[PDB]
């Protein structure tokens, strides 16, 4: 009995079929399966997933069962031993700017949300698990080594909930646990518009039959706009400054304020889209509300399309990037469109990116008065700074001017994210992404690193010198073998992150494959695709190929220098030039006339 019969919360639609728009839920993509791709269903098991008990607790969860005959270490003991590091110097990628970095975390967003489970919404629960630091139900707490400096300054944990799984009420079969995507599996501009209708709705102008999407009403940026704000509370945002109480942004994304400069991103894009509405309505001033928002939401899509796969995919994949992503053959609904658990994992590979700083700069691209840099951690659910403190272009220069933390094997996450990360619900600058991403691993049944290695066609090391050949780097292989006793054990974050880096990329070989693999499959399976011909015309394509993210910023901000190649390194103002001197979106093959 094969079973496609789970995945209980989602709204349930018919498909126009017709229709030259994207659904919201993601539904309706694949004609022959409506439901592949869209959001509120299981992640893709590209392998089955791992338990300790066949079917739902983590390995680690029960301190005596063996993964494979040995312990598996405390996430925060291989976090400690091995990812954290204390010298930023020489910490930087020299041809990656912070957009680069930037970019990885938006792309991320849209393809891919595994929320934590809720249950507790006011809850006692939340307590049982944060002071009392006790496993069980979705409670799965990272437990502080011995020696452990937050065993002196927090307790005896940090507080870890579950991931979302499938039918929070299974169909009474018997079955391994898999994890809810609550965002569109294809590359759609979710994060911005939402995956839920009704989100999506409030997020749009309705007063207005112009397609805009709804702006802040109290604030605002030179004249340029803010996003909405989520009046729900109590805010992650007015928590980490009291006298500012300014809350964090409504965005189609739930994370679009975890840092400042994810809130512009987010910022950035709503601003186009409101721009190619207003742009639109020139054009065609008989077009109503809905065509306006959807053909706009319609290009806005292509765009984030463009750029990862034109500008971002070939400088991480590298060398790998034809190997695995070749030129396009058209939508081949064979392809399944869904978003891998273990791609999930593979794409955080972006945390090594994130430096420890953001800067705001001036118009002449230096220090923006006296607290320029700020530590990163200061700026996790911080809209304040934004709004009361700068807009967003003294950010955004910093995107362009400043670099992305390159990933090194002796210094691989910095401390204001290893140490110092804010969670939405906690009150502690306090938590650990590196640490948190291992338990995470484990709470959605991972298969380990040589499982991986395997599935990608990879030698699968066993040995200490096994594994020494494969990372080329004695000391890290032997800190590994001691912490996990077998390659085999090795949890896919730190495995695959801990390869060095392919030719010409910023992952190795084993993340240039998981990775590779999932980006062919968002594209060749999506029926939506802005090369699929018919989804464009062949002109307003030829149209589509001039959009850059130097426009983006030009058409959206009040800089008026900025790079060609806004992805690699770019110092001013030799690697600078004029608005003026960048290609602009030609939105005449847009103009629909009845005669
Ligand atoms: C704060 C955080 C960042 C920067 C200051 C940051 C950065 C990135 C980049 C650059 C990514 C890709 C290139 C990327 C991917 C994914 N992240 Fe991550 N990230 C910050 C904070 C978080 C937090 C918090 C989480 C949740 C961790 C948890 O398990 O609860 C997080 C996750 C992810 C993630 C998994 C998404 C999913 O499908 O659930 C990425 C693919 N990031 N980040
Ligand atoms: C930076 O990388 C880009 C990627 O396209 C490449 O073309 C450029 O020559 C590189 N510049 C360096 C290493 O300074
Ligand atoms: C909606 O559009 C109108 C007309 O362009 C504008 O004046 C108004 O402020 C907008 N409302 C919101 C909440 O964005
Ligand atoms: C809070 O914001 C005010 C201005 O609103 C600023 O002067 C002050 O330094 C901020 N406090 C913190 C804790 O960041
Ligand atoms: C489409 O995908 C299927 C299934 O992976 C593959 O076997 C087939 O060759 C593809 N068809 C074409 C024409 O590319
Ligand atoms: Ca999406
Ligand atoms: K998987
Ligand atoms: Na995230
Ligand atoms: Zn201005």
């Given at each position: 009995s094969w079973e496609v019969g789970c995945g209980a919360p989602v709204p349930l639609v018919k498909c126009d079929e017709n229709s030259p728009?994207?659904?919201?839920?993601?539904?309706?993509?694949?004609?022959?399966?409506?439901?592949?791709?869209?959001a509120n269903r299981a992640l893709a098991r590209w392998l089955p997933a791992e338990y300790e008990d066949g079917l739902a607790l983590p390995?680690?969860?029960?301190?005596?069962?063996?993964?494979?005959?040995?312990?598996?270490?405390?996430?925060?003991?291989?976090?400690?031993?091995?990812?954290?590091?204390?010298?930023?110097?020489?910490?930087?990628?020299?041809?990656?700017?912070?957009?680069?970095?930037?970019?990885?975390?938006?792309?991320?967003?849209?393809?891919?949300?595994?929320?934590?489970?809720?249950?507790?919404?006011?809850?006692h629960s939340k307590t049982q698990c944060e002071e009392y630091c006790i496993q069980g139900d979705n409670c799965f707490p990272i437990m502080f080594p011995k020696n452990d400096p937050k065993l002196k300054t927090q307790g005896k944990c940090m507080p870890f909930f579950r991931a979302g799984f499938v039918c929070p009420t299974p169909p009474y079969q018997s079955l391994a646990r898999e994890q809810i995507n609550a965002v569109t599996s294809f590359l759609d501009a979710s994060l911005v518009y939402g995956s839920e209708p009704s989100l999506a709705s409030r997020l749009r102008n309705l007063s207005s039959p112009l397609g805009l999407m709804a702006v802040n009403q109290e604030a605002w940026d030179h004249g340029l706009a803010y996003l909405p704000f989520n009046n729900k509370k109590p805010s992650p945002c007015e928590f980490i400054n009291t006298t500012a109480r300014v809350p964090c942004f409504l965005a189609g994304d739930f994370r679009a304020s975890e840092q400042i400069l994810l809130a512009t991103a987010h910022t950035?894009?709503?601003?186009?889209?409101?721009?190619?509405?207003?742009?639109?309505?020139?054009?065609?001033?008989?077009?109503?509300?809905?065509?306006?928002?959807?053909?706009?939401?319609?290009?806005?899509?292509?765009?984030?399309?463009?750029?990862?796969?034109?500008?971002?995919?070939?400088?991480?994949?590298?060398?790998?990037?034809?190997?695995?992503?070749?030129?396009?053959?058209?939508?081949?609904?064979?392809?399944?469109?869904?978003?891998?658990?273990?791609?999930?994992?593979?794409?955080?590979?972006?945390?090594?990116?994130?430096?420890?700083?953001?800067?705001?700069?001036?118009?002449?691209?230096?220090?923006?008065?006296?607290?320029?840099?700020?530590?990163?951690?200061?700026?996790?659910?911080?809209?304040?700074?934004?709004?009361?403190?700068?807009?967003?272009?003294?950010?955004?220069?910093?995107?362009?001017?400043?670099?992305?933390?390159?990933?090194?094997?002796?210094?691989?996450?910095?401390?204001?994210?290893?140490?110092?990360?804010?969670?939405?619900?906690?009150?502690?600058?306090?938590?650990?992404?590196?640490?948190?991403?291992?338990?995470?691993?484990?709470?959605?049944?991972?298969?380990?690193?040589?499982?991986?290695?395997?599935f990608c066609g990879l030698s699968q090391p066993k040995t200490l010198k096994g594994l020494q050949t494969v990372l080329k780097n004695k000391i890290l292989a032997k800190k590994l073998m001691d912490l996990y006793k077998t390659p085999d054990n090795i949890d896919i974050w730190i495995g695959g992150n801990a390869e060095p880096m392919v030719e010409r990329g910023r992952v190795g070989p084993l993340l240039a494959c998981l990775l590779g693999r999932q980006f062919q499959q968002?594209?060749?399976?999506?029926?939506?695709?802005?090369?699929?011909?018919?989804?464009?015309?062949?002109?307003?394509?030829?149209?589509?190929?001039?959009?850059?993210?130097?426009?983006?910023?030009?058409?959206?901000?009040?800089?008026?220098?900025?790079?060609?190649?806004?992805?690699?390194?770019?110092?001013?103002?030799?690697?600078?030039?004029?608005?003026?001197?960048?290609?602009?979106?030609?939105?005449?093959?847009?103009?629909?006339?009845e005669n």
């Open positions: 728009y994207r659904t919201i839920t993601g539904d309706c993509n694949n004609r022959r399966s409506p439901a592949l791709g869209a390995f680690g969860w029960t301190q005596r069962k063996t993964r494979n005959g040995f312990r598996v270490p405390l996430a925060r003991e291989v976090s400690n031993k091995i990812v954290g590091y204390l010298d930023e110097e020489g910490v930087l990628d020299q041809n990656r700017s912070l957009l680069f970095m930037q970019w990885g975390q938006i792309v991320d967003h849209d393809l891919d949300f595994a929320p934590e489970t809720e249950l507790g919404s006011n809850e950035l894009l709503l601003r186009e889209h409101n721009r190619l509405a207003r742009e639109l309505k020139k054009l065609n001033p008989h077009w109503n509300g809905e065509k306006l928002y959807q053909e706009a939401r319609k290009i806005l899509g292509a765009f984030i399309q463009i750029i990862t796969f034109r500008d971002y995919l070939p400088i991480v994949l590298g060398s790998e990037m034809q190997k695995w992503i070749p030129p396009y053959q058209g939508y081949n609904n064979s392809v399944d469109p869904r978003i891998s658990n273990v791609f999930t994992f593979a794409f955080r590979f972006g945390h090594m990116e994130v430096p420890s700083t953001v800067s705001r700069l001036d118009e002449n691209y230096q220090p923006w008065g006296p607290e320029a840099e700020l530590p990163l951690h200061t700026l996790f659910f911080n809209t304040w700074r934004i709004i009361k403190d700068g807009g967003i272009d003294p950010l955004v220069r910093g995107l362009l001017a400043k670099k992305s933390k390159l990933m090194n094997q002796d210094k691989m996450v910095t401390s204001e994210l290893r140490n110092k990360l804010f969670q939405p619900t906690h009150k502690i600058h306090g938590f650990d992404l590196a640490a948190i991403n291992l338990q995470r691993c484990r709470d959605h049944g991972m298969p380990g690193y040589n499982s991986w290695r395997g968002i594209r060749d399976g999506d029926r939506f695709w802005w090369e699929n011909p018919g989804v464009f015309t062949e002109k307003q394509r030829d149209s589509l190929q001039k959009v850059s993210f130097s426009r983006l910023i030009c058409d959206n901000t009040h800089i008026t220098k900025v790079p060609l190649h806004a992805f690699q390194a770019n110092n001013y103002p030799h690697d600078f030039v004029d608005c003026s001197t960048v290609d602009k979106l030609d939105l005449s093959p847009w103009a629909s006339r």
